[PDB]
Amino acid sequence: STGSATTTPIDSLDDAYITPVQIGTPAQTLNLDFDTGSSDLWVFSSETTASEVDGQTIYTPSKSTTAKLLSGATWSISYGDGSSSSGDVYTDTVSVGGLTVTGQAVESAKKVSSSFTEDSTIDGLLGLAFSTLNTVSPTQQKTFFDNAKASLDSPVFTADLGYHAPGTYNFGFIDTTAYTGSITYTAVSTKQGFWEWTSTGYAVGSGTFKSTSIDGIADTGTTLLYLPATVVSAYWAQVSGAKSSSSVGGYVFPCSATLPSFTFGVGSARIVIPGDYIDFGPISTGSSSCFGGIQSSAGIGINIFGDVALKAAFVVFNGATTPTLGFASK
């Protein structure tokens, strides 16, 4: 089997991407944030504290003839941005882009933190990291991909995120029309539960490539590119007036700037992030200070190849017995 679904930016800055997902019978379609940095599929629901729902579409398990309470199971997750959610668990039928999994754990939120409530466009998350990170207790549950894998034509999914435009998540096949040149594959460590790999270095603009190993994660659920402070400083030093602002929480730059590109290495191959991908717009409405899309990972404890990086590439998440990642230009 295969599936193919369009993923759409939630706003004009590509702050996140939503993909429609069918849950239950009859189908309830929710727009979920596909997150290769976590491993829980959770949704706003009829069980979510009412004051914490503000415009989201909810899953109502009592209206699904295939929903079953997973007795005694609870979940609770906290993300790197400080947001969190928790609740109980149903199993139900979940389909993405024509690919159907029966008995998928659908984690129903009883509580969500303020940033979730405040974002009306995201109805929940669909985790695509390794199932070892799944938070369901006392019986850990599998991701949608893990459940689907054996049925797929090939045990892969691909992320093809757009810049200020829709893109595609495919399951079970590689669309050879969706990228240019060849796909370069690189090793993955699953030790921390992530799609963790080692970039071979970077360049800033038209500058020379610096060969250096950068361990990080391919994370569709993180908006920006988080790299070591040395790398980030080298990038922003090429933008007149750019500075790290403790009050804003990262590097900012004059909105009048033309940003240089940023290149990262995948083996001997190179992925070029155009400068415009690195502009996250005014820090507050009407400001001429703009937020940067490349930020320091110092104090995160891990480098994160988030959407800023991934949207410059066609990315293969290869879930073969020994997982790997593939990157192509597009």
Q: Which of 232, 271, 264 is nearest to 251 (CA)?
A: 232
Token reading at 104? 């998928």
Distance in angstroms (rounded) separating the CA atoms of residues 276 and 200: 23
Residue type, 279: D
Strands 243-245 and 250-254: antiparallel
The token pair at 63 is: 């209206």
Q: For residues 240-275, b (16+ Cβ closer than 10 Å) or e, as one string?
A: eebebeeeeebbbbeeebebbbbbbbbeebbbebeb
Side chain identity, residue 4: S
DSSP state of 144: H
CATH 2.40.70.10 domain span(s) along the chain = 5-174, 175-330
Note the Cα 244 to chain centre separation in Å.
Answer: 25
Q: Any catalytic annotation for residue 199? A: yes
CA distance 242 to 228: 17
The three-state DSSP-derived secondary structure of 84-137 is EEEEEEEEEEEEECCEEEEEEEEEEEEEECHHHHHCCCCCEEEECCCHHHCCCE
What is the dotted CATH code of the domain comprising 175-330?
Answer: 2.40.70.10
What is the end-to-end Cα distance of the chain in Å, rounded?
A: 25
CB 329 within 8 A of CB 313: yes
User: What span, in angstroms and rounded, lies between the C-alpha atoms of 133 and 38?
Assistant: 7
> Which of the following is catalytic: 35, 219, 279, 307?
35
Catalytic residue among 39, 86, 131, 199: 199
Q: Please state whether beta strands 184-187 and 196-204 pair in parallel, antiparallel, or not at all (unpaired).
A: unpaired
Euclidean distance between CA atoms 215 and 196, whole angstroms? 7
In sequence order, what DSSP letters do the residues of 199-231 get, joined into one string?
A: EEEEEETTSPPEEEEEEEEE-TT--SEEE-HHH
Determination technique used = X-ray
Does domain 5-174 fall under CATH 2.60.40.10? My reply is: no
Catalytic residue flag (residue 81): no
